[PDB]
Design a binder for this molecule. Sequence first.
Ligand SMILES: *[C@@](O)(CO)[C@H](C[C@@H]1CCNC1=O)NC(=O)[C@H](CC(C)C)NC(=O)c1cc2c(OC)cccc2[nH]1
Ligand SMILES: *[C@@](O)(CO)[C@H](C[C@@H]1CCNC1=O)NC(=O)[C@H](CC(C)C)NC(=O)c1cc2c(OC)cccc2[nH]1
Lengths: 305, 305
Amino acid sequence: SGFRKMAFPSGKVEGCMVQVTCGTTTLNGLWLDDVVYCPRHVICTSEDMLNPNYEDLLIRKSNHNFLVQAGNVQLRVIGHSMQNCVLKLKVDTANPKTPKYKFVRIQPGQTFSVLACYNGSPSGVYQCAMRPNFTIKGSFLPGSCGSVGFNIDYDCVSFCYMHHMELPTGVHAGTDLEGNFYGPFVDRQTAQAAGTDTTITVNVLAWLYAAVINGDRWFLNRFTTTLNDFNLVAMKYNYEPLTQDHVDILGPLSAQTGIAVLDMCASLKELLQNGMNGRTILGSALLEDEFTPFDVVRQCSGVTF
Amino acid sequence: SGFRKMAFPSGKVEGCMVQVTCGTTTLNGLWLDDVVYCPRHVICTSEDMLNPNYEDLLIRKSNHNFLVQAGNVQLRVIGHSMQNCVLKLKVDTANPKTPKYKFVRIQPGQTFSVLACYNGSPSGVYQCAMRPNFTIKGSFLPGSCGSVGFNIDYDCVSFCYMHHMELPTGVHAGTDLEGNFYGPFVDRQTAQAAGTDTTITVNVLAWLYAAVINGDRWFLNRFTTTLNDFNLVAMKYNYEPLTQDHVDILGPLSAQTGIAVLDMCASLKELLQNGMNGRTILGSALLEDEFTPFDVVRQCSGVTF
Ligand SMILES: *[C@@](O)(CO)[C@H](C[C@@H]1CCNC1=O)NC(=O)[C@H](CC(C)C)NC(=O)c1cc2c(OC)cccc2[nH]1
Ligand SMILES: *[C@@](O)(CO)[C@H](C[C@@H]1CCNC1=O)NC(=O)[C@H](CC(C)C)NC(=O)c1cc2c(OC)cccc2[nH]1
């Protein structure tokens, strides 16, 4: 039993974390096979960051301009290409620690593990969720650019995020491993705001099932609601609408506890209208939306990786 | 910026997790060099765990009664012995992924990272804190015995916890890597109850320092107390008394903010006596206690490994 914010074991990613230096800028790279992936603004100077023409700046660079570091071993760049905001540095040596990998673009509401890195060395691992406004509530310091977000299925690591910047509100934005930004953000040194951030509803419902599975039942009530009537109240409190797919995903959680999904919705409806009155749920004074139904099932059901 | 629970990179510990089977019972083991460490109750069947005589059970066990597997590959046991509640199995092969390691016994309040494992395959990693009643509020499922808790100091990995059981209350208990239980618990199929939990006072002070390092400093009292006077008032609110390593460990955080430890102690006593009056600190208004002063230094500074 128990329920913690759990990230995937990071060992498969640590073997790919390298250091990419170009000029006087240093960030992190992901060394898969004979390619090294890193944010493209490593090639930028301090003056270039304001308004960078990247294909312009990239054409003015060469292979020997990039300093790639893997441990205490300098990796030689034998070629360079650019895919959106991601730089691709081909090297002479392949990574023996390359796992089975894939490049996916997660949908908002999904979760992934972040391996915070500085100068190509892993600092810490933690779990994030892609918020509906395509930002993440991460923990990043200058030099964390190039850190990747990931999920592991069987022995396959599915990369989905690369860190790029920090918004003025403390949240963070980045790209997938193809270079496409999550959200309306761009890789320039400007103050960028995001859209209004809604609450991932189906994540809150799975979190409540996790509390019931762990013996916390103070929030349940003897009422039920229709899917539309719940979405009507949920929309009023800036919650994403619950879909028939979301209800289907919560199926196993409803089966284990015997509480219908539409029953849990009446509890979340009550919680939004009345508050928690100073009590806690799973030790939290707030409604938590950073756990997917899989995250709860993989913990509470007993699934292992 | 961004502050959240952050676990150590689990790669170095991943390469030390193995499977230990005795008859029909399977748990997890820690393989460092040519010795595998695991809970001693692996030599038990279902009815053996009720009232086990561990010295009498080990006398009827041989080296070939032990199945040690790295993945699916078996490591032959060339020697077995017992230290308290852990089992030591000498293996014919030395682990090439063995890092520089240590066996340490941590104090209630210190944090570590748990790498949850099932059948020798790491499942997830999360940060825990040792509660003052010597339990941990973990997240374990059947087959998780042998999962280790650890801290990383530079290139050294310090092992400090080996999981053993789950209390009726939902929390968990275990031993260090020397076999000695944390608390008054024993490895048996017995209903065991921990003592009354308290708040890790040194950890809320580091968290208040973490808030001061950022924006929130609204709770600064401009008052002081003696170490003795605060300890007497803190115990009246189910808070742990401050020891000596507590005051000295808060040193770097006090020098960074210029706010003395005893000055911060009076700010916290003001928050215990009159509450927070609907004000929030670092987001959640719940007085977090699972961040050590190192967790603040390590996160706010970007210490890598
Ligand atoms: C990378 O590590 C550098 O390659 C760095 C990581 C973030 C900054 C510190 N903490 C982080 O998460 N990324 C940046 O510094 C980026 C630069 C590229 C072009 C994206 N810039 C920002 O994150 C940034 C710039 C500004 C700003 O200007 C003006 C004004 C307000 C906020 C802001 N964030
Ligand atoms: C290990 O996997 C056993 O190898 C197992 C892990 C716990 C069980 C599931 N989740 C866990 O954290 N450990 C145990 O089963 C131990 C075995 C002891 C050390 C011999 N037992 C318990 O954790 C346990 C026993 C009892 C109990 O009795 C009956 C009554 C109430 C709670 C309880 N927990």
